[PDB]
Design a protein around this ligand. Structure first.
Ligand code: BFC
Length: 7
């Protein structure tokens, strides 16, 4: 969930 967490 890149944008949010990174990973
Ligand atoms: C608070 C939420 C934690 C979610 C942790 C998910 C770990 C497994 C997935 C990793 C890849 C993820 O970052 C790709 C997003 O699109």
């Amino acid at each position: 969930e890149l944008x949010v967490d990174x990973l």
